[PDB]
Amino acid sequence: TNARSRIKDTDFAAETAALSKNQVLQQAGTAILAQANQLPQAVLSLLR
């Protein structure tokens, strides 16, 4: 049984950190996109 856990039993005290990292990335790349999609808007609004 102890083996069965060493196989399966996630050391989620580490995977929590991994988890935050993923949540974090979702957030960050999103905000980057909210910024990114403003670029072409500016380009044309000005050249016009």
Partner: protein
């Protein structure tokens, strides 16, 4: 420039991120690092 947005590359990365995210949450629910799914089928077997 307007014809497209190279910054959709950002999007791609996030898709990967969200995939990882969901799988992690599965592992955190059941406590099984090897999902009942095939993934790492050796240890599963």
């Amino acid at each position: 420039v307007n014809t497209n947005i190279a910054s959709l590359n950002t999007q791609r990365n996030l898709n990967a991120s969200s995939n990882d995210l969901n799988t992690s949450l599965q592992r955190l629910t059941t406590g099984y690092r090897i999902n009942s799914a095939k993934d790492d089928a050796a240890g599963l077997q």
